[PDB]
Amino acid sequence: GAVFKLMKSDFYEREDMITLKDIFGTETLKRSILFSFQYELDFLLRQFHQNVENITIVGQKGTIMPIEARAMDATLAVILKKVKLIEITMPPFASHHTKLIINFYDNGECKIFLPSNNFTSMETNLPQQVCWCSPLLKIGKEGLPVPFKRSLIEYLNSYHLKDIDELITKSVEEVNFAPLSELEFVYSTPSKFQSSGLLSFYNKLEKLSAGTSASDTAKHYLCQTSSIGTSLSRARDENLWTHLMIPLFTGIMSPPILPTNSLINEYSQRKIKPYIIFPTEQEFVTSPLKWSSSGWFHFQYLQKKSYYEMLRNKFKVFYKQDPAMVTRRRGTTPANSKFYMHCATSQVFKELEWCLYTSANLSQTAWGTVSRKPRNYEAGVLYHSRRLANTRKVTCRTFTRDPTHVAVPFTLPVIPYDLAEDECFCLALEHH
């Protein structure tokens, strides 16, 4: 079955879990196809077994740094001949953030992974990272269409590159995706020709919950992100999660933004509970590598503080690790995974209506809006309870207590920010 694993760190596990070497080092691996925002080629290529025949690497022109001669050795020169680069030219202010691995093995097997780390030593080892692992898939003729496969192919098409069409999509097409028949592949693309991002995700959730009646249940919506974008509007404080996404998902608004005070009453009246997990200032003090992982966490609110105060004090949206539940070896180190999830009710989040794990951070550029398309490539997997084989809920557990559908790096429960003391981490330095 598909499984979430916590990526091992050279620092936190020194002497359940996965490493890049488990993914790439297997002697039966024949081919890997990789997508990422950043590759450190000498670090990445050292993960592979000599048996590998091809490594196809997709990334933005310039995010694939060649190995300098001084860092070459015998082994690397051999693996390097097996590398095919597909270099993407992005529009301005657009990023290729998708992290995706498609592996093909000796006996026609295939396995797909979504790691939260870029392929660099620093990303892999500093902030907490996770990796979703598909079940084993087999090359073979397909029966009924599998949504995950259809969406993955739309997504690949949306690069509009002949090399992707020929070298990747054709190979994906041969794979039977039946073991993924419960899951959805949810993505963003700048392609004008393919709907994606928030509008498509919203339409997908509306379709997946069709018929479901309303309840007096509390409605919990949680986001864990390593970036929090600024206001959707220059004239008003409006946050993507609280003002647009949650209101869409709950039915507060439809596609054809509400005043903040109206939203707060609506949340109170519908028992909506919003959460954003983002590191506090003090959680770096109780992290083993201290502020080392802090550069991955971006929420630059100092220039428009009222937007932050609104989130912190009016929506009371911020949540932090339970310092009693974290391991000694990881402490309160923040995670660079992105999860979005919904629970309808301490035990909160252990049974979910749905959960999306993705590269997409909480920004307009990753998700778009109702009217604007995403600027980035992003990809993720969605578990939806109505899509499960059995009439059941998606189950979730925290890695900090280490089978469930989902596993998250944050504690369960998470703890509200203490309004007297806690503040989201934000550093303004001279260089930025």
As a three-state string, the secondary structure of the chain is CCEEEEECCCCCCCCCEECHHHHHCCCCEEEEEEECCCEEHHHHHCCCCCCCCEEEEEEECCCEECCCHHHCCHHHHHHHCCEEEEEECCCCCCCECCCEEEEEECCCEEEEEEECCCECHHHHHCCECEEEECCCEEECCCCCCCHHHHHHHHHHHCCCCHHHHHHHHHHHHCEECHHHCCCEEEEECCCCCCCCHHHHHHHHHHHHCCCCCCCCCCEEEEEECCEECCCCCCCCCCCHHHHHHHHHHHCCCCCCCCCHHHHHHHHHHHCEEEEEECCECHHHCCCCCHHHHHHHCECCCHHHHHHHHHHHHHCCCEEECCCCCCCCCCCCCCECCEEEEEEECCCCCCEECEEEEECCCECHHHHCCCCCCCCCEEEEEEEEHHHCCCCCCEEEEEHHHCCCCEEECCCCCCEECCCCCCCECCCCCCCC
Residues 6 or more apart in contact with residue 108 via CB below 8 angstroms:
138, 139, 140
Name residue 383's beta-bridge partners.
Answer: 355
How many C-beta atoms surround the C-beta of residue 400 within 10 A?
A: 19
Cα–Cα distance measured from residue 162 to residue 159, given in angstroms and rounded to the nearest whole number: 9
The amino acid occupying position 131 is C
| Whether 200 contacts 321, CB under 8 Å | no
**Nearest to residue 99, comparing CAs of 45, 35, 55?**
35
Q: How far apart are CA 251 and CA 269, in angstroms?
A: 13
Q: Whole-angstrom Cα distance, residue 305 to residue 114?
A: 35
Tokens 């050292």, located at residue: 46
**Domains of the chain, residue spans:** 1-182, 183-432
Instruction: Evaluate the omega torsion of the peptide bond into residue 115 and state whether it is cis, within 30 degrees of 0.
Output: no
Residue 102: beta bridge partners?
33, 112
Neighbours of 68 (CB within 10 A): 9
Q: Could you tell me how many residues make up the chain?
A: 432
Contact 266, 406 (CB under 8 A): no
- CB-CB contact of 125 with 336 (8 Å): no
Two tokens at 362?
């909480």
- CA 390, CA 384: separation in Å to the nearest integer? 12
**How far is Cα of residue 303 from the mean position of the Cα atoms in its chain?**
27
- Token readout for 380 is 């993720």
Q: Which tokens hold the place of 6?
A: 């916590």
Nearest by Cα to 188 from 363, 406, 394, 4? 363
Let me know if 300 is exposed, middle or buried by CB neighbors in 10 A (0-12, 13-18, 19+).
middle
- Reference 360, options 242, 226, 247; nearest CA is 226
What residues form DSSP beta bridges with 343?
A: 220
Structure tokens at 200: 């498509």
Residue 147 amino acid letter = P
- Superfamily in which the 1-182 domain is placed by CATH: Endonuclease Chain A (3.30.870.10)
Inter-residue contact 317 to 274 (CB < 8 Å): yes
Give the count of beta carbons closer than 10 Å to the beta carbon of residue 314: 15
Domains 1-182 and 183-432 share a fold: yes
| Angstrom distance (rounded) from CA 100 to CA 286 | 31
Residue 394: HSE in the Cβ half-sphere, 13 Å Cα cutoff: 28
Q: How far is CA 290 from the centre of its chain?
A: 24
- C-alpha dihedral over 404, 406, 411, 415, to 10 degrees? -110
CA distance 147 to 188: 16
* DSSP strand pairing (272-277 vs 318-320): parallel
CA distance 227 to 212: 33
Residues 398/411, Cβ–Cβ less than 8 Å: yes
* Chain centroid to CA 231: 21
* Token pair belonging to 326: 């974290």
Indicate the class that CATH gives domain 183-432: alpha beta
Strand order in 338-344's β-sheet?
184-188, 378-384, 354-358, 338-344, 219-224, 272-277, 318-320, 415-416
Tokens encoding 412? 């369960």
Q: Please, which residues have CB within 8 angstroms of residue 346's CB and are 6 or more apart in sequence? A: 413
| Side-chain-side CA neighbours of residue 196 (13 Å) | 32
In angstroms, rounded to a whole number, what is the distance separating the alpha carbons of residues 67 and 59?
Answer: 16
* Planar angle of CA 102, 103, 105, nearest 5 degrees: 155
Distance from C-alpha of 132 to C-alpha of 151, rounded to nearest angstrom: 17
Strand-pair category, 109-115 with 272-277: unpaired
Evaluated on CA atoms 110, 44, 128, 340, the torsion sign reads negative
Q: Is the dihedral of CA 18, 20, 25, 31 positive or negative?
A: positive
| Strand order across the beta sheet in which 406-408 lies | 351-352, 394-398, 406-408
Torsion angle defined by CA atoms of residues 376, 337, 114 and 370, in that order, rounded to the nearest 10 degrees: -40
Residues 6+ apart with CB under 8 A from 47: 20, 21, 23, 24, 25
Question: What long-range pairs does 288-293 form, CB within 8 A, spacing at least 24?
Answer: 288/11, 288/12, 288/329, 288/330, 288/331, 288/333, 289/11, 289/126, 289/333, 292/126, 293/126, 293/127, 293/128, 293/333, 293/334, 293/336
| Angle, CA of 109, 9 and 119, to the nearest 5° | 55
Look at the alpha carbons of 224, 300, 9, 381 in this order and tell me if their dihedral is positive or negative: positive
Max intra-chain CA distance, the chain: 66
C-beta separation of 57 from 85 below 8 A:
yes
